[PDB]
Amino acid sequence: VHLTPEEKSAVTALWGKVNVDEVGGEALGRLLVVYPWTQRFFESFGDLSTPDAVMGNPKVKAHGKKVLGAFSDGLAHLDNLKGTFATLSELHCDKLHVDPENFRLLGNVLVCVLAHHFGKEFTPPVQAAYQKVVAGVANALAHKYH
Amino acid sequence: VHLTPEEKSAVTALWGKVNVDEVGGEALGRLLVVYPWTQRFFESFGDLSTPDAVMGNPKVKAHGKKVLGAFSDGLAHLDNLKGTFATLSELHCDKLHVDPENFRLLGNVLVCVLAHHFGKEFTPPVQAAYQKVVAGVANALAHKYH
Amino acid sequence: VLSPADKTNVKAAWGKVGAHAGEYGAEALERMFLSFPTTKTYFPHFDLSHGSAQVKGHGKKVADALTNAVAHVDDMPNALSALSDLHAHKLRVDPVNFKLLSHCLLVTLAAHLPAEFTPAVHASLDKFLASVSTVLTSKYR
Amino acid sequence: VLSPADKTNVKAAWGKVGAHAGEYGAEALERMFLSFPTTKTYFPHFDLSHGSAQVKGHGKKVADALTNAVAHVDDMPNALSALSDLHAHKLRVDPVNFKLLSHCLLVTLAAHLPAEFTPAVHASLDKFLASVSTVLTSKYR
Ligand code: HEM
Ligand code: HEM
Ligand code: HEM
Ligand code: HEM
């Protein structure tokens, strides 16, 4: 993904401060509340009926951890997102049957959560770089769909 | 863009039979009727108040043929869409200020028109190949946007 | 909003289709699956090979719904209320896909009705399919 | 459709924005121009540089219009009528761009309202912005 070193060091800069244990659950949780239709993939996660039931749902929190862990690993390989995510791409498509549009929604939500946690330090320039990142990640996860 | 050699072939075979004058005028005229907001870029062409005025406007027709000309050249370069349309991308961004989202619209109109002309011959597999071409072209036209 | 000239255009157009609604329905589905493979994630249980029955059958169900919408054009939200219900609470298809199927319907119609698919008619049908989509996703949240 | 709960969330959140609106609006536009450069095609005459006086002044206008929709949340299509005509006949911005700016507004508000930006408020504000966008885009054709 065409990313300047300016873009790259800033992205990496900020990520150092991220509590993956928290941001992952916030991001997955907000996805399920803001775009309620995406709940069609997580019925087995139990009760998701009110905002609190979703945000505090332990399976939602555990699962968001896994999501962000894999994301972190993508930030470690920004020059090979496609290869880094190929088996996850095959899985989401062949086993889980997830519409790739869903990766873009999560990307955008994640950006709002970032903003929420860092305030002023989430500058427009820093946002612009994170938008390129979530777009690259979303594209890499969709690439093996056929 | 990843085109199959038989897809590359399906596209070339059909293009070989396109009447560029007719098809070009028809695609552009339809873009202007189906999506009236696109008219913002062609104020100088004249009266465009109605579908008939638009489809009969000789400058629209002449411009339709020129656009499809640039498109034809792109089919001779399917392995290098970016390089072929680099300067056309600079132009459409720096001097004309055209939002690339408009390229996708013209692409889809272009596909209905070919369907309209070739009928039974514009089969689902043939359509699938031309959908990739049109996206590829749209993406190359968008490349130098900054 | 659909104008009177739009409603006329869509009844006329849909009128010819006539008995061929079911087939054009199936054809649009096939074009969508091959042109936009991500749409297939919503149909993991169907055989999607060319001309197979599941697709045949669903093609008619889609067409009937539209025929229904054409005959109830001044009252779409009410005539489609249960379908909207079903999309919002059970199917949950991302809204972007509706444009993809809409386009494939337009292509299918252009291919089968060369005389009727004028630019004014093209315009009306597009607005109509967009209005239908709006209705089907109105209760998502 | 906005619900009673959404209206409440929206009024409370915009209430906390207050006299920072023109400023959040300008920040939203700046976020938009850097994250999605295609949007700059609609402002070729504006000096878009950070701190630009034209940009701040424009944020204010965007913000005031949002304030008027909050103030008339039960009569939005009519309170925004003049704005919807301007967009359809003059501005003619492509619908996809309204989502980009909405997203940037949400980011701007999350960046400034840590306590009010709960999952439920974010959900209502997102819905609200999608309805504003729909109104402003409703008379395009
Ligand atoms: C940043 C993008 C995403 C990443 C990196 C990601 C990563 C992962 C990982 C690591 C797993 C566990 C894999 C396994 O069980 O073997 C997973 C599972 C799953 N993902 Fe995603 N995911 C993403 C987005 C999405 C979204 C948008 C959806 C649907 C809305 C989704 C739906 C699922 C489902 C349904 C599972 C299995 C749940 C279960 O265990 O029952 N993923 N994802
Ligand atoms: C398939 C994608 C397109 C291609 C290949 C294409 C190609 C061209 C070409 C060859 C020219 C002539 C440039 C010159 O030598 O002066 C042109 C001009 C122009 N294009 Fe495009 N075009 C495309 C799509 C669009 C669309 C979608 C819009 C807006 C809806 C647009 C807006 C314009 C405008 C405003 C001009 C200048 C017209 C004038 O001279 O008055 N183009 N384009
Ligand atoms: C023009 C818009 C559409 C209309 C009018 C429409 C109509 C219908 C109808 C009438 C049904 C059967 C409802 C029943 O169970 O009685 C159905 C089912 C279904 N539709 Fe569509 N549909 C539309 C668009 C879409 C799109 C865009 C998708 C996704 C790409 C989609 C995916 C589905 C799925 C997954 C089912 C359930 C099939 C099954 O499991 O048997 N639909 N639709
Ligand atoms: C939240 C949705 C939006 C609202 C409420 C809004 C509101 C406004 C207002 C009040 C004006 C001043 C018009 C006047 O009265 O003279 C304006 C102008 C304008 N807007 Fe927006 N706008 C929105 C979205 C957009 C977006 C998505 C675009 C394109 C990216 C855009 C581009 C423009 C342009 C080009 C002008 C005219 C600039 C000039 O003065 O030359 N707007 N808008």
**Of all protein residues, whose CA lies closest to atom 13 belonging to ligand 2?**
B88
- Name the token pair of D72: 């008339």
> From the CB of A11, is ligand 1 less than 6 Å away?
no
D45 is an annotated ligand-binding site residue: no
Contacts of D26 (CB under 8 A, 6+ apart): D55, D56, D58, D59, D60
Q: What is d(CA A68, CA A66) in angstroms, rounded to the nearest whole number?
A: 6
* Triad D82, D31, A66: Cα angle to 5°: 120
Distance D4 CA to ligand 3 centre (A): 30
How many residues are present in chain B?
146
Picking from B39, B33, B15, B3, the residue whose alpha carbon sits closest to that of residue B111 is B15
CB atoms within 10 A of CB D37: 14
Distance A88 CA to ligand 1 centre (A): 8
Main-chain phi, psi angles of B85, to 5 degrees = -105, 15
- Name the token pair of D16: 């906390």
Contacts of B103 (CB under 8 A, 6+ apart): B137, B138, B141, B142
Distance B39 CA to ligand 3 centre (A): 34
C–B contact (≥3 CB pairs within 8 Å)? Answer: yes
Q: What is d(CA B101, CA D95) in angstroms, rounded to the nearest whole number?
A: 10
Q: What is d(CA C89, CA C136) in angstroms, rounded to the nearest whole number?
A: 11
Ligand 1 pocket mutation, candidates A23, A92, A99, A143, criterion most atoms within 8 A of CB: A92
> How is D96-126 classified by DSSP, letter by letter?
HHHHHHHHHHHHHHHHH-TTT--HHHHHHHH
Domains belonging to chain A, first-starting first, are: 1-146 (1.10.490.10)
- The ranges assigned to domains in chain C are 1-141
Q: Looking at the complex, report in whole angstroms how far the Cα of residue C118 sits from the nearest Cα belonging to chain D.
A: 17
- Name the token pair of B12: 């070339």
How many residues are present in chain A?
146
Q: What is d(CA B30, CA B36) in angstroms, rounded to the nearest whole number?
A: 9
Q: What is d(CA D66, CA D29) in angstroms, rounded to the nearest whole number?
A: 14
For residue A70, which atom of ligand 1 is closest to its CA?
Answer: 5
Main-chain phi, psi angles of D79, to 5 degrees = -70, -25
H or E element that contains B26: helix B20-34
Picking from C20, C24, C22, C47, the residue whose alpha carbon sits closest to that of residue C107 is C24
Picking from C82, A6, C103, C137, the residue whose alpha carbon sits closest to that of residue B127 is C103
Q: What is d(CA D119, CA D110) in angstroms, rounded to the nearest whole number?
A: 11
Main-chain phi, psi angles of B28, to 5 degrees = -65, -45
Query: What one-character DSSP code corresponds to residue A3?
Result: -
CB atoms within 10 A of CB A131: 21
- Name the token pair of B6: 């038989």
Q: What is d(CA A123, CA A143) in angstroms, rounded to the nearest whole number?
A: 30
Query: What one-character DSSP code corresponds to residue B94?
Result: I
H or E element that contains A117: helix A101-118
Query: What one-character DSSP code corresponds to residue C7?
Result: H
Contacts 24+ apart (CB under 8 A), A16-22: A17/A118, A18/A117, A20/A65, A20/A68, A20/A69, A20/A72, A21/A65
> From the CB of B67, is ligand 2 less than 6 Å away?
yes
Contacts of D104 (CB under 8 A, 6+ apart): D28, D29, D31, D32, D35
CB atoms within 10 A of CB D53: 10
Report yes or no: B117 and C113 within 8 Å, Cβ to Cβ.
Answer: no
Task: Please answer yes or no on whether A112 and D106 come within 8 Å at the CB atom.
Answer: yes
- Name the token pair of C116: 């009727």
- Name the token pair of A53: 């039931």
* Triad C15, C19, C20: Cα angle to 5°: 95
Distance A67 CA to ligand 1 centre (A): 6
Q: What is d(CA A110, CA A125) in angstroms, rounded to the nearest whole number?
A: 16
* Residue in chain A lying closest to C87 (CA): A37
- Resolution of the experimental model, in Å, one decimal: 2.1
> How is C49-94 classified by DSSP, letter by letter?
STT-HHHHHHHHHHHHHHHHHHHTGGGHHHHTHHHHHHIIIII---
C-alpha gyration radius of chain C: 14
- Name the token pair of C5: 């000239």
Three-state SS for D25-51 is HHHHHHHHHHHCHHHHHHCCCCCCCCC
CATH topology of domain D1-141: Globin-like (1.10.490)
Q: What is d(CA C62, CA C76) in angstroms, rounded to the nearest whole number?
A: 15
Q: What is d(CA D105, CA C90) in angstroms, rounded to the nearest whole number?
A: 31
CB atoms within 10 A of CB D82: 9
Query: What one-character DSSP code corresponds to residue D88?
Result: I
- Name the token pair of B124: 């689902």
Query: What one-character DSSP code corresponds to residue A132?
Result: H
Give SS3 for D86: helix
* Residue in chain C lying closest to A145 (CA): C38
Determine whether D77 is exposed, middle or buried from the number of CB atoms within 10 Å of its CB (0-12, 13-18, 19+).
middle
- Name the token pair of A94: 């062949």
Contacts of D29 (CB under 8 A, 6+ apart): D55, D58, D59, D62, D101, D104
Report CA D66 to chain centroid distance, whole Å.
6
Give SS3 for D141: coil
Looking at the complex, does the CB of residue B102 fall below 8 Å from at least one CB of chain D?
Answer: yes
* Triad C45, C49, C53: Cα angle to 5°: 70
Main-chain phi, psi angles of C50, to 5 degrees = -60, 130
> From the CB of C65, is ligand 3 less than 6 Å away?
yes
Helices A58-75 and A20-34, interaxial angle, to 10°? 110
What are the CA-CA distances from residue C30 to residues A51, C100, C108, D98 (Å)? 39, 12, 10, 32
Q: Return the beta strands (E) in A8-144 as ranges.
A: none
